C-alpha cells in the first residue's frame, strides 16, 4: 500500500511544566501578588472540576459475559514474555525472561495484527500460552530519564554567549519550528552537537535553557547511568532509550559526559572492558541506525575533547563542534549584571574594576564572588554591599589554583 | 627514518628535500611565460591588512638591468639568494666587461642551493623563476631547493601550481606575442585566486630586448585589467 502501518500509531508526550513563566516584576510588587493569585484560582478550579468529575458519575457497571469469563479464562498471575518468531497456525514460539523458549499456543482473541517479532506479550503458567499482547511498555530505568519539569530560566538567564546560542538554535529549534528554509535548498539539518570547553562555562546551562523553551520531549541521560553488569544490560538500554525517543516526539536526547563511555577502543580480553566496549560500539551503531530516526536530536557534552574516540567525532555522525572558552572582558559585564540583579547593590562599587584586573575567571567564578561578597556584608552586619566586600571576596575565592608564572622574565 | 639530511631511505631518497618542496606549496602563485618578443611575468600579492604597506611585499626583484626574478615559499630563505645573485653578476662584469647570461646566473645560485650539509644547516625553502634577455634571446628558467636547474617555456609555481600548469598548457604555443601573453596570463590568475582581481592583488614585470629598462608596470596595469 501507500501508507503501510500508518507509522506506528503513536503520539508524543511532551513536558507539562512552564505553567506560567510571566512573573515579570521579579520584585516585591502587587502585580506578582495579583499574578500568582490568578494562577491559584485556575489550579483550584481545575482541582474542583476533576473532583466533581469522579463525584457525579453514577455508573455502577455490570461487566459483559464475554469479558468477565475471559478474565477468568486467563490466569490471575499473568506473566510478561517476549515474542521471538510467529507461526500463524495459532501457536508460535516465544521466550521467557530467562530465555526458555516454548511452543505455546496463542489464543484467538489477541487481536492478531500487533504480533511483530520483538513485541511484548502476556503468558499463562499452566500452558504458558499467549493470553494477550502487551502494549510497548518499558522498564522503570528509562522512565526516570524522561523530564517532567522545565527546570529553570530562559535565555535571559545566561550572561552573553550569543555567538554560540545562535548556533544551537539553528540546529535544534529552527528545524522544528520552521522547517521551510531547508526544503528551499534541499539541505538536511545537522544531527549531533558536541559542547566542549573548560569547566564552569555554561555547558549545562544551555542544555537547561533549551529544555526550558521547547516543544520537544527532552531526555536526560548522564553518562554512567547507562552502564550495568548483567552481560547484556548495557546494549539493551540504548535500544530501549532510542525506541522511546523514536516513538515519541521530534525529540532531544541529552547525554552528558560521554567521555565516561567513550575513549579510543582498547580490547583487553578481560570481561570488564568488553561490557563497556560492546555498549560503546552499539550506541555508535544505534546513532546511525538510519531505519527511521524520525528527527531525534542528540546533544553531547564533555570538558575534554582530546580523549575521545575519533569514530564519534567524525562527520556523518556528529556535525557540530562548539567551543565554550573563558569568554572576554565584555560578557563578564553581563554576568555581573545578572548575578547582582536581585541584591541591594550599594552605589560605591565599580564592578568594572574586578573585570579589569583579571582575565581568566569563569561564570561559576562570578557567581561564587557574588555569593561571598553578600556573606561578607552579613559578617559586618549590613544589607547593602560595599566595594570592600567584593575586594575581600575576590581575594578569598580566587587564590586556590593560581600557580606558575614567569614574572620578570617577560615584559 | 628521515629526521636529518645525512640519512638514506631503503628505497631512495630524501625525505628531507621532499619536505622542502612541500614548503613551497604554501607560497603565493607566480606565472612567467617565455616568448620571442620578450619574457613577461606575473604574481599574486595576498595583502592582509590595509594598514600593511603594499610595496614592502616584494615578489619581483630586479637582479640586474636585464634579468628579473620571482619567488615563492619562505621569504627568509629568499633574501639570501637574492643578495648573492646580484653580487655574482656584478663580479662577472667587473672581471669580464660583459653581462652574465641568464643560464649562468642560476649556476652560481644553485652552487649554494646545494651546500646545506656539504660543508667539510637545512636546505632552503624557496623556489625561483628567472627571466631575462641575453645574447641567445629571451630566456626563462626555474630552480628548486634541490638545486635542480632547468629551462621552462612557461612555468607556474607556488600554491595553485598544478591547477595553473594544466590550464597553462592549453593556451601556449610557439608563435605567441608579448601583448597576447600578458592577457593570456592573468586570465589564469583570476581563475586560481580567491578574490576579485583588481589593480591591488597582482603585479607584472616584462623584459624586452630593446627595453632593458622597466621590468615593471605602474598603473598601466589598470588599463590591462579592463582589457580582459
Amino acid at each position: 500500500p501507500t501508507r503501510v502501518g500508518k507509522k506506528k500509531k503513536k503520539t508524543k508526550g511532551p513536558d507539562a511544566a512552564s505553567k506560567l513563566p510571566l512573573v515579570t516584576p521579579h520584585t516585591q510588587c502587587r502585580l506578582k501578588l495579583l499574578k500568582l493569585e490568578r494562577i491559584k484560582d485556575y489550579l483550584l478550579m481545575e482541582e474542583e472540576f476533576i473532583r466533581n468529575q469522579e463525584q457525579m458519575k453514577p455508573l455502577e457497571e455490570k461487566q459483559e459475559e464475554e469479558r468477565s469469563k475471559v478474565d477468568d479464562l486467563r490466569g490471575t498471575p499473568m506473566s510478561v514474555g517476549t515474542l521471538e518468531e510467529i507461526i500463524d497456525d495459532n501457536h508460535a514460539i516465544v521466550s521467557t525472561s530467562v530465555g526458555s523458549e516454548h511452543y505455546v499456543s496463542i489464543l484467538s482473541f489477541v487481536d492478531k495484527d500487533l504480533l511483530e517479532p520483538g513485541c511484548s506479550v502476556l503468558l499463562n503458567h499452566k500452558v504458558h500460552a499467549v493470553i494477550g499482547v502487551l502494549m510497548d511498555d518499558t522498564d522503570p530505568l528509562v522512565t526516570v530519564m524522561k523530564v517532567e519539569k522545565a527546570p529553570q530560566e530562559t535565555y535571559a538567564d545566561i550572561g552573553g554567549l550569543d555567538n554560540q546560542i545562535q548556533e544551537i538554535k539553528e540546529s535544534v529549534e529552527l528545524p522544528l519550528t520552521h522547517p521551510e528554509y531547508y526544503e528551499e535548498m534541499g539541505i538536511k539539518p545537522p544531527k549531533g552537537v558536541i559542547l566542549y570547553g573548560p569547566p564552569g562555562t555554561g555547558k549545562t546551562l544551555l542544555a537547561k535553557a533549551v529544555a526550558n523553551q521547547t516543544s520537544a520531549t527532552f531526555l536526560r541521560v548522564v553518562g554512567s547511568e547507562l552502564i550495568q553488569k548483567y552481560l547484556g544490560d548495557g546494549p539493551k538500554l540504548v535500544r530501549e532509550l532510542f525506541r522511546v525517543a523514536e516513538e515519541h516526539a521530534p525529540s532531544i536526547v541529552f547525554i552528558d559526559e560521554i567521555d565516561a563511555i567513550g575513549t579510543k577502543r582498547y580490547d583487553s580480553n578481560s570481561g570488564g572492558e568488553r561490557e563497556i566496549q560492546r555498549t560503546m560500539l552499539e550506541l555508535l551503531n544505534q546513532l546511525d541506525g538510519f531505519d527511521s530516526r524520525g528527527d531525534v536530536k542528540v546533544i553531547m557534552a564533555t570538558n575534554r575533547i582530546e580523549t575521545l574516540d575519533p569514530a564519534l567525532i567524525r562527520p556523518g555522525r556528529i556535525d557540530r563542534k562548539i567551543e565554550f572558552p573563558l569568554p572576554d572582558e565584555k560578557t563578564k559585564k553581563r554576568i555581573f549584571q545578572i548575578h547582582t540583579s536581585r541584591m541591594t547593590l550599594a552605589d560605591d562599587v565599580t564592578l568594572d574594576d574586578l573585570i579589569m584586573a583579571k582575565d581568566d575567571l569563569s561564570g561559576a567564578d562570578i557567581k561564587a564572588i557574588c555569593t561571598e561578597a553578600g556573606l561578607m556584608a552579613l559578617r559586618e552586619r549590613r544589607m547593602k554591599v560595599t566595594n570592600e566586600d567584593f575586594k575581600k571576596s575576590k581575594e578569598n575565592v580566587l587564590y586556590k589554583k593560581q600557580e606558575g608564572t614567569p614574572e620578570g622574565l617577560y615584559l | 627514518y628521515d629526521r636529518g639530511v645525512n640519512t638514506f631511505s631503503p628505497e631512495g631518497r630524501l625525505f628531507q628535500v621532499e619536505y622542502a618542496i612541500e614548503a613551497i606549496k604554501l607560497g603565493s602563485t607566480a606565472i612567467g611565460i617565455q616568448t620571442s618578443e620578450g619574457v613577461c611575468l606575473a604574481v599574486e600579492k595576498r595583502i592582509t591588512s590595509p594598514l600593511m604597506e603594499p610595496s614592502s611585499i616584494e615578489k619581483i626583484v630586479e637582479i640586474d638591468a636585464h634579468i628579473g626574478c620571482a619567488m615563492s615559499g619562505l621569504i627568509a630563505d629568499a633574501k639570501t639568494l637574492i643578495d648573492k645573485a646580484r653580487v655574482e653578476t656584478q663580479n662577472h662584469w667587473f672581471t669580464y666587461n660583459e653581462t652574465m647570461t641568464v643560464e649562468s646566473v642560476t649556476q652560481a645560485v644553485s652552487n649554494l642551493a646545494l651546500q646545506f650539509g656539504e660543508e667539510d644547516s637545512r636546505p632552503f625553502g624557496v623556489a625561483l623563476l628567472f627571466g631575462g634577455v641575453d645574447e641567445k634571446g629571451p630566456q626563462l628558467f626555474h630552480m628548486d631547493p634541490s638545486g635542480t636547474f632547468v629551462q621552462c617555456d612557461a612555468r607556474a609555481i607556488g600554491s595553485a601550481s598544478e591547477g595553473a600548469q594544466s590550464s597553462l598548457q592549453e593556451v601556449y604555443h610557439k608563435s605567441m606575442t608579448l601583448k597576447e601573453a600578458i592577457k593570456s596570463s592573468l586570465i589564469i590568475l583570476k581563475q586560481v585566486m580567491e578574490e576579485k582581481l583588481n589593480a591591488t592583488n597582482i603585479e607584472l614585470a616584462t623584459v624586452q630586448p630593446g627595453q632593458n629598462f622597466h621590468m615593471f608596470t605602474k598603473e598601466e596595469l589598470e588599463e590591462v585589467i579592463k582589457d580582459i
Binding site: - | 628505497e11 631512495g12 631518497r13 630524501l14 628535500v17 628548486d144 634541490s146 635542480t148
Partner: protein
C-alpha cells in the same frame, strides 16, 4: 617456473633476470609474485606475462610505488 606452470605465461622468461632481482624473498613471496603477475595481466586483459609483470609483482608485494622524483635528472 613451477608455480607459473598452471597459467598462460609468455615463453620469453629470463630466469637469470628472475634470479638476481629477487632478494630477501621467501618462496611464499615468490609464489605471491607469480600470482600477482598473473593478476595484473588479468587487469589489462593480456593473455601472457612478462618479466616486467614480475617486477610489477615485486612492487606489489612490499607495496612499493615509483614516480619521477626530480632529484635524478
Amino acid at each position: 617456473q613451477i608455480h607459473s606452470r598452471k597459467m598462460n605465461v609468455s615463453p620469453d622468461v629470463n630466469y637469470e633476470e628472475l634470479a638476481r632481482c629477487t632478494d630477501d624473498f621467501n618462496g611464499a613471496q615468490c609464489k605471491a609474485v607469480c600470482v600477482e603477475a598473473g593478476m595484473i595481466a588479468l587487469r589489462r586483459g593480456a593473455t601472457e606475462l612478462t618479466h616486467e609483470d614480475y617486477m610489477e609483482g615485486i612492487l606489489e608485494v612490499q607495496a612499493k610505488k615509483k614516480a619521477n622524483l626530480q632529484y635524478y635528472a
